[PDB]
Symmetry: D2
Subunit: 380 residues, 4 copies
């Protein structure tokens, strides 16, 4: 299902390298796809190959040793290709990819003081040396920096083989994101990921129990604000490519199956057109919103608040559309293929479980999406 202002071909030469680089892992990812789901395990042997070949440095700037992909359009594109084979992997890789871009931004436009830190991190990631995961969602109480760090985060995809965590916290005497090494004392990685889908993503819990952190590794974060919407967009929007990829994958499998099969009954034609029509909408909506985030990513010239809303609002329309239609496309695909797809090991079963992850992801889920977008529309 081809689209023009679509998520179909890369916009930048850099991004184009990444897709070419990524081409060699597809047959592999596909090949292990089942076991990783069955066991809910991140494919480490594979992540090393890719780290060592400089995939994990994709969004790291040219100068600091990365491939210099600086386009969310292109990141999303790459995640879609992966997601079509293993979406939990895509979900894991996103953490790095986005981390590449969030860091680049701080390096150039952030607090005067924290540019060197960003630079180290970015340069490290470029060397194929750091694997970084933001750890955001607090569980059983909130997570506390006092420097000694105490707390527990949840669903940190890829923490299994991460070398450092960027950790959202409340600093106590306001807000901050200490960068904490894997090898730090009093840090634990839990083996508790039991997702219905996204299982190869290893979204495990992390415990901080009186962990050391030097001020040389603290990035500050405002106070416990519309301009922040921009960062929130930058860090999540390419995840939308994942679900588009899942949808395309379902479609391929079903079209293949239907083609070797018949024959085209009346139910089959209608549903196929329904599927391709949504797929088309998914591509154009997602690409539009990505175009917006990319255009504004590096433009701090205007009013920074309206700049924030300008990035989030489309992101949120797209997410609303994706969370509704990517699930529906997958469902209709499973329907067209039939019972064989119900078997848990079958690729559609995996895609059906995988695709349902998107709707809880923040910002925003359905409830909070409604709040935001109606407020945009109503003023009240």
């Amino acid at each position: 299902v081809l689209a023009d202002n679509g998520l179909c071909e890369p916009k930048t030469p850099a991004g184009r390298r990444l897709l070419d680089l990524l081409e060699r892992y597809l047959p592999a990812l596909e090949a292990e796809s089942r076991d990783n789901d069955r066991e809910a395990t991140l494919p480490v042997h594979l992540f090393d190959r890719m780290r060592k070949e400089g995939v994990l440095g994709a969004t790291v700037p040219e100068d600091l040793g990365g491939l210099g992909v600086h386009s969310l359009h292109d990141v999303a594109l790459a995640l879609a290709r992966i997601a079509g084979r293993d979406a939990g992997v895509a979900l894991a890789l996103h953490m790095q990819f986005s981390r590449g871009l969030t860091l680049d931004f701080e390096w150039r436009h952030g607090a005067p003081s924290t540019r060197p830190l960003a630079e180290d991190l970015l340069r490290q990631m470029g060397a194929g040396e750091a694997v970084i995961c933001g750890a955001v969602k607090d569980v059983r109480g909130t997570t506390v920096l006092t420097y000694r760090l105490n707390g527990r985060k949840t669903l940190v995809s890829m923490a299994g083989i991460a070398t450092h965590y960027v950790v959202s916290t409340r600093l106590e005497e306001r807000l901050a994101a200490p960068v904490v090494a894997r090898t730090t004392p009093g840090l634990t990685v839990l083996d508790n990921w039991d997702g219905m889908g996204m299982r190869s993503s290893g979204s495990v819990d992390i415990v901080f129990d009186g962990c050391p952190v030097d001020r040389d590794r603290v990035l500050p974060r405002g106070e416990p604000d519309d301009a922040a919407l921009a960062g929130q967009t930058v860090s999540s929007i390419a995840m939308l490519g994942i679900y588009v990829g899942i949808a395309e994958a379902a479609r391929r499998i079903a079209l293949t199956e239907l083609r070797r099969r018949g024959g085209a009954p009346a139910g089959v034609r209608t549903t196929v057109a329904e599927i391709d029509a949504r797929l088309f909408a998914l591509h154009t909506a997602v690409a539009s919103a990505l175009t917006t985030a990319d255009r504004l990513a590096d433009d701090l010239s205007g009013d920074l608040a309206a700049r924030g809303r300008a990035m989030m609002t489309p992101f949120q329309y797209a997410k609303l559309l994706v969370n509704r239609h990517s699930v529906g496309v997958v469902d209709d695909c499973l329907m067209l293929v039939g019972g064989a797809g119900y078997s848990n090991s079958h690729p559609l079963a995996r895609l059906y479980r995988d695709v349902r992850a998107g709707g809880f992801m923040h910002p925003y889920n359905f409830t909070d999406g409604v709040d935001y977008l109606s407020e945009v529309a109503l003023g009240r």
Copy 2:
């Protein structure tokens, strides 16, 4: 939960109610073993033994032949909903007993004269707890043939046979070969030589339903043990309804369960964001539609179930048509209710072990079941509307 007048809320027959009362003592256990039974994808045998022994598996055996005399598809569907609200897999398995009682009963009272004694025998054994009978219907890897110097040979494979593990007999649909080709349903004992039951069940959901494969490799069958079945007719549609319609109960019960789980969760949080009110209304509206459309189709099937009196082809269409409309609605709205419940609860529901996960997964099974899936349903229903 959501209330309807001609809904699936209350039993219509006193026999129906006795069953609901009997099933009540098992709900707590089904609920407790729900999770492990899901993880391991294992039928809960002990519980089946308890139910068998205590008389439940003979629920739809007429009171004269030693069963509980539930002759209502409506009340069976209702029973199935309740069970399905704690474990949809076991409901799917118990359906096999319940529908069998009813189809056998039809054969006992309305089938070919030679077939009746055999239907009587099977019914008595079910009522006595000595017969757990499954229908082996779906061919895999070739089709299944019975061949006839008088004596019978059975050769084939069947897939997705719920409860096949603890069954004592199977009723296997086949081609019969020598006349030209006729269809037939022999009753084949679990211990019949050449028969292998296969532990290959790994469904996304319905995992406790034990829907495994059976292989028949030169199995011997008696001439006095064959149930006769036409040839490869709209009058047959009636039978196709009796043996499946009650399953619509399973999904309504699933959606009822999801709705219970979510409301409890929202009542706990005492928010009421503007998305939450809209969804909850829309969920409840759909439940109301499911409840009424499914009961209506059930009521029609019960009314014609014992009425052989006009045109039999017409009678067939008249039972299958409402059945198919309700299935279509259930298959769309069941999943939709469950999805919206899951959305309302949020992330905790995506944990595979969580009850919503298990319902999200279980509820998707209905759309594949025949008669009919979406595509054949459309054909059937458009045919009934266009005459073409």
Copy 3:
């Protein structure tokens, strides 16, 4: 049409069957006039006279007080469905008569001591074919208020809107606030056509239901004698009951409309021969939704009939018990009756887009259900969510 076992298919009561048999002779005429009544947006008086004189408008008056004795919301809805298949705007007007029958009959048997004779009189006149009674419910241009003049007489001031069938009425039950002295209370005064200060406007221009004559009435200092209830902003759930009784049978109208759209499109499709892949899927989805509508509305009507004359339990719960099914049904009907009609029009194609085409009329008529109170979508969501959540 489409065949549901507990659908809106056959009547549940003998008086119900009398009504259906009576309505037959008008079906040809309603159909014939349909296109003109629509184009002109004019209630067909000649026809209402026929029907008045032959006993129709007394359908829901009890047998004793000279009526047909129809007591079943099921059977009224059925009847409205039949009418609505030919002219929905007419069905809509008639509902005004039918519901009033039921509401008065309730008041007759169960209102306070003082009210029962007024009910009796009002029913008897309906029975004789002499009273034609309308509810004037919705305010426009401010609210409608009833006050005591300092001379002990009563004053009624305000404006009502969308009053179906008002133009040929002899009586209006007018919803007002009673303002005195005391706190504000609610009153439903009964006011004669000729009460001076009352004007029936000619201002009905709906995109559909054009034949329903839903005009405005001005109440310009209108006299009401000390003779002819509740309190505003006050949760009174037991009252939800009469609100159900007075509106639910309207759902039959939109079912009738969808059945018609279906019949029309199927006729065309058979006429057309070949059945393409989009047609089949659409036909199936149409019939399925039809199936849903028939069973959901029948279900809610059944609940209302079961409880209409049952006042034995907790009356607030009785109220909720009647409204909740009504409102599921209403939500489903307002989505799917519109849907089905659209699809019927899609199947038939360009010819149905011409304004005079019967499908254009049904496309327009069916859009009216969604606005009707109780409840439009937004209050529907508020009500049913409050029911589900407990707050």
Copy 4:
């Protein structure tokens, strides 16, 4: 409106911008005349006269030939969106001119050698404001034939839903040609040809201002110098999908605009109305989401059409499909969601909008016309799209 980056918000070409500015001056009158034109079902002749005399009916005529050189379907859709926000039937009528500019341009540059001088003539006449050309396409009461004698030409039949036919000076008539084997053709017939009758029978539920009347051709004399060639009947030719796109795709802007109008009216009303009940926030979010979809989806399909409009370099059957396919996904999405959005707006405003003279009533009636327009309605759309997908 609701904002998308590659949405239908901004023009892409300088001619598109000049077209858009030129249109802002008619927007007030359109709006003022909106209710009358609808009630009476009358095409605003006068307003068309100003627009013709004033350069606008030749917007898509190239500059070299006297017009404004608007080459972009994206920009044409944009213009139609703007107009449709005030009066969709007027937008619908104008599209006859706009699309004719583009299609004639192609024939001028790429039709058969014998076609091009005829094309050039018609474009110059449009640019000069002397010609107003309608496509009379859809048959009613039999099919429409042009028979070739001595070599003279007679045209017999009926056309319908010829929007803007009443102020036309020429028609380009879809016909079967008989003699030589059975060809397809498009004779160019002048207003004042004998035997030609423009009826006044337009009674649409919506698009009431569009003047979509029937025409009757009764033994009409068409000269040999003036017959555009069109290929052959029944013969599947996917290259033809290119043209079929070019002459219809910009219509999609109308329903975007209509939906965007309903949204303006509803929000205004809700914002005036104060509080937000829990149903309102949700409907508002879904309205907005759907409009976001429609903008990006329609804009994508227009872009595709623009990229292929002049590039005839590969397989032309492939080119056609590459054009018709996104078109049809978009039409599918628009025919669904513009209708839904307008429904939901009308739900949000309440009973007032149910009054036939209310603007939302006009939009509700108007927006439903999209679903019937060919290519394709839903069923033909399903056939085409499933065929592209299954290869069968």
